[PDB]
Every structure is written in C-alpha cells, then in structure tokens.
Amino acid sequence: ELELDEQQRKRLEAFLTQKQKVGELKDDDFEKISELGAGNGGVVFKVSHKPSGLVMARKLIHLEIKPAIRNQIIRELQVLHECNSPYIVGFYGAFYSDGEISICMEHMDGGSLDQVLKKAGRIPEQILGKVSIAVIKGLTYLREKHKIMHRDVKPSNILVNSRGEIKLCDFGVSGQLIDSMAVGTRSYMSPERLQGTHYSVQSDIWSMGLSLVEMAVGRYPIPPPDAKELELMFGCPMAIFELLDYIVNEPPPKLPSGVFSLEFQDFVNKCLIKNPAERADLKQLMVHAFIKRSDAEEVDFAGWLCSTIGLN
Ligand SMILES: Nc1ncnc2c1ncn2[C@@H]1O[C@H](COP(=O)(O)OP(=O)(O)OP(O)(O)=S)[C@@H](O)[C@H]1O
Ligand SMILES: O=C(NOC[C@H](O)CO)c1ccc(F)c(F)c1Nc1ccc(I)cc1Cl
Ligand SMILES: [Ca+2]
Ligand SMILES: [Mg+2]
Ligand code: NA
C-alpha cells in the first residue's frame, strides 16, 4: 500500500528537485499573499518565498520561550525533510523568528476538508472513499517509515488540491512542540485517549472514522441527529466537557441507514468501535470491502472538488 504510482513518483521527484533549490529559510525572505486560516494557537499564511519564487503555506506558532527551548523544536521538525509521500503535505523548513516558530510547507490550493465541507454541505460517499484511502495510506506511511502516529486526525488536518491530491499535516513529529503547546479541540479524540488509557495508531483510526461521519452527514455527529434532523438532512448546544463525557460514556456515532452503502457504514463502524483492541487496525482497513471497492472506482476527485469550491 506504500508502492508509488508513476505519476506519483514523478510528482514527488519534482517537489524534491524544487526543494533542493531552496536554501536556509529566513524571516525576511517571505512576502505575505493572504491569510489561510487560524487555530487556537497558530495562524497560517499563503506566502511567496521571494528568492526561489516558490509559494508556500507558512504556519506561525507564537511562543515565548528561551532560545534554548525553541532551538530544540526546530531540531525535531527536521525529520519532516524525510517524510516524503503522496499522502503527506510537503515540508520546506522551520525557523524561529521574533517570538514565533515558523513551519513552511507545500501550499494546498483546495484548503482543508473542514473548509471544503462547509462549502459542500456534505461530501459524497465516493469522494469519502478516496479520502479514506489517503488517510489510511498516510497513517501507514508515518507508522512504517517513521514510527510516528499522527495524534491529531480531524478534517482541518487533511488538505486537498486541484490536482486531486489528499494529504495529512499537523502530525506529531516533534514531542517538544506537542508539550510546549499542551488548546486544540479534543472533540475528535478517542474514548481511550480521553480516559487516559491505551493509545496507539488505533486512536487515529477512531478520529478518522468520526471525521468521515461528520463529512458524510454535514455536521459534527455527537450527539446524534434526532429523527427530524435526519429528515431535513436527507429527506429520509453541548459544552465541550459535556461532549467529551458523551464520547466516553455513550455508544459511538454511526451513519444513518438507507442513504449510505452497507460497506461504508460497516467501514465507519469498524473505525468507531470504542474498544481499541476490537477496533479495526490499518492492515485490516486497507483490505476492507469499502476500501477495495473505492480503490477500484474511477472517481474524479479533482473535478468534484474544483466544481464544489469554485476553483478556477
Ligand atoms: N499547507 C497548507 N495549505 C493550505 N491551507 C493550509 C495549509 N496548512 C494549513 N492550512 C489552513 O490553515 C488553517 C489553520 O490551521 P491551524 O493553525 O493548524 O488550525 P486548525 O487545524 O484549523 O485548528 P486547531 O489549531 O488544531 S484547533 C487550517 O484550518 C487550514 O485550512
Ligand atoms: O502544527 C501542529 N499542530 O497544529 C498547530 C495548531 O495551530 C495549534 O493550535 C503540529 C503539532 C505537533 C507537531 F509535532 C507538528 F510538527 C505540528 N506541525 C506540522 C507537522 C507536519 C507538517 I507537513 C506541518 C506542520 Cl505545521
Ligand atoms: Ca525579519
Ligand atoms: Mg491544523
Ligand atoms: Na517577520
């Protein structure tokens, strides 16, 4: 599942060749083009790297900490130069400057899936089959090649582009950056992680499953939509601490029946089993009926995406 396509192998080669031409990244070398969005502790800009002419996405994480500390995150982040996969957002470099840490990456012109979902309303099952393949492959890659688990799968961390690529970002490559930060939503965290118990890649599988249900139905799915909400949805509020308690104590969300294929409902159900030991693992998901069916479908993801977000 980590074997590269010809077109994929080529795109990777092109990104690396371009990358080699970029030297050490420095603050003054960037011109801001626009604001891509912001989280609970970071802002992201679309920027031009003046010298190279490359357009990048630059994330600034404003953090006030001794030169000692900062210099350590920069060190761990250097691992990103080794994360090369069609399913992982490309990295250019990381530097510290005037209080904030900068992480420069490949700009994804389709933005993140939370943005796409807001535009689309809900994302069709066949499109989510391709998204599922990408996420599982991206997680397999991180695990196999870098012994890293993502730790923060959610729609805003899956990015897409007009070429039809789907990629993960914001994965836990640096332990120190994770600690020095660590308030990001806990709303996609597995029950085991919320309970302080057992967490491995199994926990990313839960987050992917919950993210797929949200994108399929068009709404964060906890607590479940009542009969009349589903009726308006297809024809066919809780405070954060209340929501995390719900996740730990109540049965997992599921897709509504009768609108999605049984293979897709079964796939999400296997990702959402509360017991991480019973929950499917990457190897099992890679050969799940829904994944095999989706891999065989010729889905024009870029055409769907471009039409939907009005790209162009
Ligand atoms: N490489 C990139 N290309 C295009 N858009 C990007 C890229 N990286 C980030 N973005 C956008 O920038 C937004 C802000 O990113 P983040 O600061 O990581 O916040 P978030 O992921 O939305 O929320 P938190 O901080 O985890 S709660 C994302 O939601 C994406 O829409
Ligand atoms: O950025 C991260 N989380 O979201 C930040 C949010 O803005 C906080 O509110 C993050 C967390 C831990 C870590 F180890 C990283 F490497 C991170 N960033 C990160 C990882 C891979 C790539 I390719 C690009 C980036 Cl940027
Ligand atoms: Ca400067
Ligand atoms: Mg993010
Ligand atoms: Na600056």
Swiss-Prot record:
Outcome reported for the amino acid change (mutating residue 59 to A): Loss of catalytic activity. Strongly reduces phosphorylation upon UV irradiation
GO cellular-component term (any): early endosome
Biological processes, Gene Ontology terms: Bergmann glial cell differentiation; cell motility; cellular senescence; central nervous system neuron differentiation; cerebellar cortex formation; chemotaxis; endodermal cell differentiation; epithelial cell proliferation involved in lung morphogenesis
Keywords: Acetylation, ATP-binding, Cardiomyopathy, Cytoplasm, Cytoskeleton, Disease variant, Ectodermal dysplasia, Intellectual disability, Kinase, Membrane, Nucleotide-binding, Nucleus, Phosphoprotein, Serine/threonine-protein kinase, Transferase, Tyrosine-protein kinase
Sites bearing Phosphoserine, chain numbering: 180
Regulation of protein activity: Ras proteins such as HRAS mediate the activation of RAF proteins such as RAF1 or BRAF which in turn activate extracellular signal-regulated kinases (ERK) through MAPK (mitogen-activated protein kinases) and ERK kinases MAP2K1/MEK1 and MAP2K2/MEK2. MAP2K1/MEK1 binds KSR1 or KSR2 releasing the inhibitory intramolecular interaction between KSR1 or KSR2 protein kinase and N-terminal domains. This allows KSR1 or KSR2 dimerization with BRAF leading to BRAF activation and phosphorylation of MAP2K1.
Consequence of substituting residue 181 to V: Increases interaction with KSR1 and BRAF
Top class in the EC scheme: transferase
Active-site positions on this chain: 152 (proton acceptor)
Post-translational modification remark: (Microbial infection) Acetylation by Yersinia YopJ prevents phosphorylation and activation, thus blocking the MAPK signaling pathway.
InterPro entries attached to this UniProt entry: Kinase-like_dom_sf (IPR011009), MAP_kinase_kinase (IPR050915), Prot_kinase_dom (IPR000719), Protein_kinase_ATP_BS (IPR017441), Ser/Thr_kinase_AS (IPR008271)
SMART domains per the UniProt record, alphabetical: S_TKc
Tissue and organ expression note: Widely expressed, with extremely low levels in brain.
Predominant location category: cytoplasm
Record: residues binding K-252a: 106-108, 156
Consequence recorded when altering residue 19 to N: In MEL; somatic mutation; results in increased MAPK signal transduction
Membrane topology note: Peripheral membrane protein
Reactions catalysed, as given in the entry: L-seryl-[protein] + ATP = O-phospho-L-seryl-[protein] + ADP + H(+); L-threonyl-[protein] + ATP = O-phospho-L-threonyl-[protein] + ADP + H(+); L-tyrosyl-[protein] + ATP = O-phospho-L-tyrosyl-[protein] + ADP + H(+)
Binding-site residues, U0126: 59, 170-173
Highest taxon of source: Eukaryota
The keyword Nucleotide-binding belongs to this UniProt entry's keyword annotation: yes
PANTHER family: DUAL SPECIFICITY MITOGEN-ACTIVATED PROTEIN KINASE KINASE DSOR1-LIKE PROTEIN, MITOGEN-ACTIVATED PROTEIN KINASE KINASE 1
Family recorded in the similarity comment: Belongs to the protein kinase superfamily. STE Ser/Thr protein kinase family. MAP kinase kinase subfamily.
Subunit and partners: Found in a complex with at least BRAF, HRAS, MAP2K1, MAPK3/ERK1 and RGS14. Forms a heterodimer with MAP2K2/MEK2. Forms heterodimers with KSR2 which further dimerize to form tetramers. Interacts with KSR1 or KSR2 and BRAF; the interaction with KSR1 or KSR2 mediates KSR1-BRAF or KSR2-BRAF dimerization. Interacts with ARBB2, LAMTOR3 and RAF1. Interacts with MAPK1/ERK2. Interacts with MORG1. Interacts with PPARG. Interacts with isoform 1 of VRK2. Interacts with SGK1. Interacts with BIRC6/bruce. Interacts with KAT7; the interaction promotes KAT7 phosphorylation.
Involvement in disorder: Cardiofaciocutaneous syndrome 3: A form of cardiofaciocutaneous syndrome, a multiple congenital anomaly disorder characterized by a distinctive facial appearance, heart defects and intellectual disability. Heart defects include pulmonic stenosis, atrial septal defects and hypertrophic cardiomyopathy. Some affected individuals present with ectodermal abnormalities such as sparse, friable hair, hyperkeratotic skin lesions and a generalized ichthyosis-like condition. Typical facial features are similar to Noonan syndrome.
Protein name in UniProt: Dual specificity mitogen-activated protein kinase kinase 1
